[PDB]
């Protein structure tokens, strides 16, 4: 999947520093999500092997018929736009957690992250 590599650029960070507000503003810039400022974006941490495994029994179960929910929890960081302005420089607030994730899978690869679960 070109979709998988895209999912990775939008939602995967193997080496997060701080996972604080400073981290969010920096990563959102690095991943090209500041033109205009994405309103919310979650990054998953850890190794890619475990995220891929959500698409199979190894680390997932079916969810909402057509999605997958992880067996394991993952370190995550949700970056939420702060201050209203949709143009850079973008201000973000970080919410770090350790929780299961829901993805859509195509051909054994995650291609979409369900953002709805990180609003809460």
Residue numbers in the entry: 3 to 122
The authors write:
Angiogenin (ANG), a 14-kDa basic protein is an angiogenic ribonuclease and member of the bovine pancreatic ribonuclease (RNase A) family (also known as RNase 5). Like RNase A, ANG cleaves preferentially on the 3′ side of pyrimidines and follows a transphosphorylation/hydrolysis mechanism. In addition, the crystal structure of human ANG has revealed that it has an RNase A fold and the catalytic triad (residues H13, K40 and H114) is conserved. The enzymatic activity of ANG is several orders of magnitude lower than that of RNase A towards conventional RNase substrates, but essential for its angiogenic effect.
The residue Q77 forms part of the β4 strand in the ANG wild-type structure. So far there is no assigned role for this residue. However, in the Q77P PD variant structure (which contains 4 molecules in the asymmetric unit with clear electron density for the proline ring, which is less accessible to solvent) the hydrogen-bond (2.9 Å) observed between Q77 and R21 (part of helix α2) is lost thus creating a hydrophobic environment. However, in the variant structure, residue P77 also retains van der Waals contacts with residues I46 and F100 that are in close proximity to the substrate binding site. However, these structural changes might contribute for the loss (~40%) of enzyme activity.
